[PDB]
Design a binder for this molecule. Structure first.
Ligand SMILES: C[C@H](NC(=O)[C@H](Cc1ccccc1)CP(=O)(O)[C@H](C)NC(=O)CC[C@H](N)C(=O)N1CCCC1C#N)C(=O)O
Ligand SMILES: *[C@@H]1O[C@H](CO)[C@@H](O)[C@H](O)[C@H]1NC(C)=O
Ligand SMILES: *[C@@H]1O[C@H](CO)[C@@H](O)[C@H](O)[C@H]1NC(C)=O
Ligand SMILES: *[C@@H]1O[C@H](CO)[C@@H](O)[C@H](O)[C@H]1NC(C)=O
Ligand SMILES: [Zn+2]
Length: 696
């Protein structure tokens, strides 16, 4: 009664090879599930993290290379364009011969980089303001500095777009880095050295005189600025509540509650907003509604910005763009990045050009590349089986509502309503294969030259920003996919109340029609549950069936949610991570992801039970002394076989809202009674704590 098939052999062999059966499952299931992988694999020099998940992404890149690298004669223009973009990107010889000239010729159009110019104040005396300089970077080049203005969906009216104001991202991965001591010292040193190196290269290329003292003085001043900005930003822990984040005022209310004076100004919000919107010939009233996500940050900005010179501000502002551009220039410029990215990521070498290039084209043409990818790589009747799994787990979520004692009846029935309304999106949009016109038209105004990679990427930034901005008065497109298909990941949108499973994730170990269903449910089953449960985590629970930010909870249930979930904040908050130097996880910042994991795996397990019930026990896998309950958990865990560079562990513990793979497994399975059954775990077994968290 062993399954003997081709596909069973492959599955079994992968499971066997990953696991370490000399470890007690009940002491450390991660080591049990993954210890074999961990012995045999080192992290590649180009990887900051590595494991079964990242291997799928490497393998997807190979597919993208195959489909992009050879011109075909039947290729529609949209595909011609992805291929030409790929070609421009992989031509290092062309790129190296251009030096930094493409940057140099760009710099004027963003009001310069003063450290890298002569007499900067006099050049731009006539023209420069903070309003204009921020707005050009934002609107033509999509770089958000000092103040992030962006058109997005209205949280409280999901069918419309509003202007948003928010705090900007920083040059370093999180606000914590700007302590610049201990585990953060090298990053800060490398960061500022990086600035200096690039300022030097630009000067040398312009044939200007180099004063190392002045360079250090101006870039250290840049760092002090950003340090202050970093300290002014709101913590993530204070940004978790979408109701608190949503403060809609008019540009007038903003002008008068959030004044800034820059270089002796003061700052005209009306003017700022219009310098951006005019890019696309739209005109804005002082009476325009704006959703301000970062009130206290704007308030805290006031005393900081006054202190600094125009020269300081623009030194930071241009640096933040130039940062992103150097690796698209010649080798010498690429090289200047090295210590910075090692410090942040642990990597000692650049990822292969063809991989970076394939990823870049995919990022900018995800429908064209998605089309090519699915033609190569993706079945057909996968779509329908997954459709079935999603039916099943949606129904399990609903069903579970009755067992759940921390909600009252109106709230439970509201949760049901939201559950039923969730719109699923599987594999890829038919559109991109069966409608050539529509796919050509998406990229109509794009025109790439194969010798002009840098102009190509600049074109993409301009086009991207212009499209986004002109959405202000347009309605949100219900049908539009929020991911390309060539993506190893899955998604929930609170705004669309939508779950999304790109073709890229619908493969082993998550899914195959030919692998055991224990594996499918423990794999993709648990992913579906994770995405659905995002609809009901500490963010998503705040949005209703239509994607609108609206309270549908009673005070009691709202309070009980918080109380139930506080258990997981404490639990994961209590994990210490060696790779990050013994630091504890942020149990608050990972909560939503942790809630989704625990809910998700529960739901998937119960759906598999409902399946075994109706259909029967399935045949065992050869070479494995486990039953299918046990394999279910085995596979769920092996999704996350892998490990981290210490430099990236320090990064991720602050910037990833997901727990690290190992703690995802331990966390969730500590909360699973079913797991402890399956592996016969003693009470107070490390893997079977007596006290367990439960939300969903
Ligand atoms: C591999 C890893 N992915 C993940 O764990 C899961 C997939 C997974 C699950 C289980 C095992 C392995 C992989 C994806 P995921 O849901 O985490 C996704 C990146 N996240 C989202 O879809 C966002 C959530 C939610 N929609 C949300 O935050 N929203 C929606 C509207 C605005 C807003 C905000 N703020 C990863 O991406 O690192
Ligand atoms: C790279 O670009 C240069 C442009 O100077 C061109 O001469 C060469 O043929 C290109 N190489 C490839 C492989 O496209
Ligand atoms: C914004 O103000 C500047 C200040 O000089 C002015 O020159 C410019 O025309 C204004 N732009 C808009 C969009 O009103
Ligand atoms: C660890 O758990 C205890 C007990 O709930 C809690 O008081 C403590 O704050 C937790 N540690 C963290 C950082 O979450
Ligand atoms: Zn998630």
């Amino acid at each position: 009664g062993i399954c003997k098939s081709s596909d069973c052999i492959k599955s079994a062999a992968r499971l066997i090879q990953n696991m370490d059966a000399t470890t007690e499952p009940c002491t450390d299931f991660f080591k049990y599930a993954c210890g074999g992988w961990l012995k045999r694999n080192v992290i590649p020099e180009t990887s900051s993290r590595y494991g079964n998940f990242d291997i799928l992404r490497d393998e997807l890149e190979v597919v993208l290379k195959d489909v992009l690298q050879e011109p075909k004669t039947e290729d529609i223009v949209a595909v011609q364009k992805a291929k030409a973009l790929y070609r421009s990107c992989i031509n290092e010889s062309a790129i190296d011969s251009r030096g930094g000239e493409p940057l140099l010729k760009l710099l004027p159009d963003i009001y310069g980089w003063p450290v890298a110019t002569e007499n900067w104040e006099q050049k731009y005396g006539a023209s420069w303001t903070a309003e204009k300089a921020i707005a050009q970077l934002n609107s033509k080049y999509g770089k958000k500095v000092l103040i992030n203005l962006f058109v997005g969906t209205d949280d409280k009216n999901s069918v419309n777009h509003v202007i948003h104001i928010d705090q900007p991202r920083l040059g370093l991965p999180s606000r914590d880095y700007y302590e610049c001591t201990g585990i953060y010292k090298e990053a800060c040193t490398a960061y500022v050295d990086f600035m200096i190196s690039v300022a030097r290269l630009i000067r040398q290329e312009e044939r200007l005189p180099i004063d190392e003292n002045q360079l250090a003085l101006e870039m250290n001043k840049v760092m002090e600025l950003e340090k202050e900005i970093a300290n002014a930003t709101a913590k993530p822990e204070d940004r978790n509540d979408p109701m608190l984040l949503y403060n809609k005022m008019t540009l007038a209310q903003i002008q008068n509650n959030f004044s800034l004076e820059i270089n002796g100004k003061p700052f005209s919000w009306l003017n700022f907003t219009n310098e951006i919107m005019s890019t696309v010939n739209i005109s804005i009233t002082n009476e325009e509604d704006v959703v301000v996500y970062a009130p206290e940050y704007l308030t805290k900005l006031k005393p900081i910005l006054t202190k600094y010179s125009a020269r300081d501000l623009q030194n930071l502002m241009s640096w933040r763009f130039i940062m992103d551009l150097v690796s698209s220039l010649s080798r010498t410029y690429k090289e200047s990045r090295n210590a910075f990215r090692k410090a942040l990521y642990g990597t000692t070498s650049e990822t292969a050009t063809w991989r970076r290039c394939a990823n870049y084209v995919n990022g900018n043409m995800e429908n064209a590349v998605g089309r090519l990818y699915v033609e190569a790589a993706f079945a057909g009747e996968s779509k329908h089986v997954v459709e079935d799994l999603i039916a099943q787990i949606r129904e399990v979520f609903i069903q579970t509502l009755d067992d759940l004692t921390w909600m009252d009846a109106e709230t439970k029935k509201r949760a049901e309503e939201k559950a039923l309304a969730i719109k699923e999106r599987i594999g890829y949009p038919d559109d991109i294969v069966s409608n050539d016109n529509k796919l050509n038209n998406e990229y109509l105004e794009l025109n790439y030259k194969e010798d002009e990679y840098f102009e190509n990427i600049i074109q993409n930034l301009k086009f991207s920003q212009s499209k986004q901005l002109k959405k202000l008065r347009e309605k949100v497109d219900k049908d539009e996919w929020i991911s390309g298909a060539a993506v190893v990941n899955a998604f929930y949108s609170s705004g669309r109340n939508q779950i999304v499973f790109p073709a890229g994730i619908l493969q082993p170990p998550f899914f195959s029609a030919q692998q055991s269903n224990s594996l499918n449910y423990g794999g993709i089953g648990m992913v579906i549950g994770h995405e659905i449960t995002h609809g009901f985590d500490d963010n998503g629970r705040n949005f209703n069936k239509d994607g609108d930010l609206v309270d549908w909870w009673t005070q009691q249930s709202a309070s009980n949610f918080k109380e139930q979930s506080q258990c997981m904040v404490y639990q994961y908050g209590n994990f210490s991570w060696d790779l990050a130097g013994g630091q504890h996880l942020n149990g608050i910042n990972t909560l939503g992801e942790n809630i989704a994991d625990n809910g998700g795996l529960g739901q998937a397990y119960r759906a598999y039970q409902n399946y075994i019930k109706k259909n029967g026990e399935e045949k065992l896998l050869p070479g494995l002394d486990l039953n299918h309950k046990q394999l279910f958990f085995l596979n769920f865990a092996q999704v996350w076989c892998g490990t981290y560079r210490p430099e990236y562990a320090v990064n991720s513990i602050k910037t990833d809202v997901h727990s690290p793979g190992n703690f995802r497994i331990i966390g969730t399975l500590q909360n699973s009674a079913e797991f402890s059954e399956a592996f016969h775990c003693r009470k107070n077994s490390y893997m079977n704590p007596e006290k367990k968290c439960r939300v969903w």
